[PDB]
Design a protein around this nucleic acid. Sequence first.
DNA 1: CACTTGGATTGCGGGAAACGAGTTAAGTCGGCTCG
DNA 2: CGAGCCGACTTAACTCGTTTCCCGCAATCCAAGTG
Lengths: 504, 466
Amino acid sequence: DEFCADKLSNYSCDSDLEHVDNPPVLEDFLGHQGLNTDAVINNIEDAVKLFIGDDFFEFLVEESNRYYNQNRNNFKLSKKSLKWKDITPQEMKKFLGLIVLMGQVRKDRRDDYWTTEPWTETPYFGKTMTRDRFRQIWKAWHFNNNADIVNESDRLCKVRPVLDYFVPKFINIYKPHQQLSLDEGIVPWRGRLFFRVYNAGKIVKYGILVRLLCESDTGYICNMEIYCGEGKRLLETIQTVVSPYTDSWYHIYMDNYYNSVANCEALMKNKFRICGTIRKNRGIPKDFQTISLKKGETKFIRKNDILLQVWQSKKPVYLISSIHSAEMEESQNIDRTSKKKIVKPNALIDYNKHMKGVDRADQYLSYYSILRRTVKWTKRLAMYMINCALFNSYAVYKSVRQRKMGFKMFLKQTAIHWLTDDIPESGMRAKPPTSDPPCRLSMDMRKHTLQAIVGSGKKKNILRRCRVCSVHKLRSETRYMCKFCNIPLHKGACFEKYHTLKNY
Amino acid sequence: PVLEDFLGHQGLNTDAVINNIEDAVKLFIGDDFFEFLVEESNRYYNQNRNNFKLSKKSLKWKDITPQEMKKFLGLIVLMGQVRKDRRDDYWTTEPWTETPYFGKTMTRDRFRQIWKAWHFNNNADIVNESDRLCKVRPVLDYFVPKFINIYKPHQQLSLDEGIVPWRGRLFFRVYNAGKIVKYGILVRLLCESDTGYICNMEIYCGELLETIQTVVSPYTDSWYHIYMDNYYNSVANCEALMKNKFRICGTIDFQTISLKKGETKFIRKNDILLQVWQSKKPVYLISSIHSAEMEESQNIDRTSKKKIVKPNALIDYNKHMKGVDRADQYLSYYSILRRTVKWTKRLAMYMINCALFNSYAVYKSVRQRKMGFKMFLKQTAIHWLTDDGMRAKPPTSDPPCRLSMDMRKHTLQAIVGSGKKKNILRRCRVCSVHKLRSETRYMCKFCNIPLHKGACFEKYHTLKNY
DNA sequence: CACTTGGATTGCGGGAAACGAGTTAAGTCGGCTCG
DNA sequence: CGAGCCGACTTAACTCGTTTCCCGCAATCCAAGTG
Ligand SMILES: [Zn+2]
Ligand SMILES: [Zn+2]
Ligand SMILES: [Zn+2]
Ligand SMILES: [Zn+2]
């Protein structure tokens, strides 16, 4: 349904590609920054504006008009109208707002929202933009220069400038809690880029590698990086991720598959503490590689302040930590045969608590279901990024002013706001008839108002012949005259026609 | 070596005039179904008339008549075309997510009063509830016999369980590790392997060969081939099933412990092949439908060779076992869904979807045209909502489009009354926000808001606050 | 023994849609006038 | 030498009371995701 011009969008891709004890750390520093914001919010609209706003729209509008012109030759297929260069920021808000709004009423195709079919009608869309205008903008929705990069068949730089817009805001609006975590999220949308072979764990993901750093209690996104490289940059996994957060003693909980003991020193150099799983083909002392435990038994070894522990489950469970002592404690778990509960290393219990109630932004991706089937690669990625920005706006809103809402309502209200244009810009002849004024076709409801006619004779409730009716040689009287220009007019259509039409 | 060919018949067993949607559906669902639902719904409500605390301003109860029940289902089915997340938000008056059609079909409270009464059994009259399913029993009874006598399946059949998801109080909470639903009602059913047509049913209910033989019962004495998964067959079952003239193929003599990769050995006894192949695990194959052979086939998956050599039995097994999912996978997520507390409603809804599915399969058998199930369902809802003096809604919030200054769109039209008189006035929206009752018969044609001439109309479009 | 959330499920009530009784505001048309 | 103002007559917008339901919130109790 769409065409590509640069041989990168939707190219070079295919289908179907889917020392025998352990002290706790005592040198636990809390010398960090406040868990707060750098901005003023009174309501939902103010919160949204910190991440998404008019400058976002200017960017989208400028690029959209440029793209269409460059490729205008295959629009020969035609359109009802061609003001395609005339997209302005106010139209683009409507374009985006309608897409977000669609998640509240979910239909199967984009083309079924703009319908006239009375059975499943949703009239608001029809009253906001026309069907063809939306499609024309859709084809023209584009995110980049399209003529600056000629040196390589990159297929990344195409969405790069969108990400560049949002990243500094995730960093400068809000700062996170002592505990952070890493993951790899993303939408199940049939994208076209496959690097599955380099994963270090996963959430169903499309297109490119995506790295998230999130606050452990709230789900706020602290950083994001995409397509870090094809496995070449996934080791030293967090070095490009937590860079702006160094020296803050954040504790990082992770489950990446490429951690190591050696890696832990790097984290200490940058003042981070970690907890996560460890692979066996790693710098694990050999004497701990050949062990046997009874179910529920643990073994602990340490070197320096790094604890390597094994708890025995169906699988031995390995955990590496630079935070906890090797102590056992009752967990909340109950065995099917025992109400006495199961005792586990405190580190494991703590680890699991901080890996949940996180990455809430990804949890809501199912909302934008319309973006799955027939979408160009770059549109899907840009939408992920917009959703992330809305999520962060919500989290801040809620954290600054405690109220109960939910992300779902935050989004509905935001869409209504964007879609609303609430910004304002004496003789025998009782009266000599006149010619039609030059202001006749000035379209303004603030000026062409209706008032009753007041006479000069004994009877003030005077009626006069309508000018429009005079044109057709009809005699019909009215009590009303246009106030702007003194022409007697009937109420209803004659007043509308006189001020609206070139003739009458 | 199957030497008896096939003694069945295929396709419609009835005079189904398949030239439209309506005549495909009525075979399974129709007016007598609704007569059943109405009779029980009116008895249920009145028999339990006390303890309702009906409020003062709601509508008074009126008994349910057949059209309302047809509307009732039609609206529920449409909710699958347009999805909203709360049952009562379909009646919202907010202009941006409005779906006005529902509002014009029946009111919110009427829908809630019918919903409550959508009952399936006269438990008040018959109290001999020894049967945990006695409350859905007549629903199950209504639909299954039709599946059997409308259409006959071709030679290859398969057996599996249907799924009705449910985390609340139920007959059982047993989960079979080889099944796809963690919890809910499991249904035992046969279907035709190519179309998914559902042929016969039983409900996992109450608490091997006794049920295998029972479900297949209407299909004995004709040489049907039945394909089975890990938990339905046995060697002994095969022997028994042969006595009723049908053949079995499926999965489930220690020598098989010996190992070989690539081509492997079989044990063959008494015309039953008991071959064991090896993949990640020993692959057991039992068959009374073909001779032993091993040959290549084109895999869907990428493989080391263009084609991979496998026991012929696996080649056929993995082509016929699709019938089970196409038979109802749609029905697990399309409408007639709830998070209700009545298990009876969830189960009854599953049964309704089976009937709609079978209607679709029949339709396609006759016509060469290809359309999905989804369109069959949408059109059905349209038909049921078609008719084989409602009050105007009050305003609740002022539309976001009122400030758009286009004098071609905003115009005064006279109100047209839905009641006895066409002329009827309404409260002026510009005056009632100051609690001044005053009445008018002119309205903005684009916005649907009542206004007075001039002084009110101008303010409503021009002023941010009025 | 859950954690968390929000959709069913339960009602209560501010307000106005509808109909008819009973007084007002704007229209039809004439036959005389000033352009 | 062209088309209207005062007056006497008809319809069409407005109060007011009164019954009857509209959907919008607001309060409890579990069923979905996965310790
Ligand atoms: Zn004017
Ligand atoms: Zn006129
Ligand atoms: Zn209007
Ligand atoms: Zn008014």
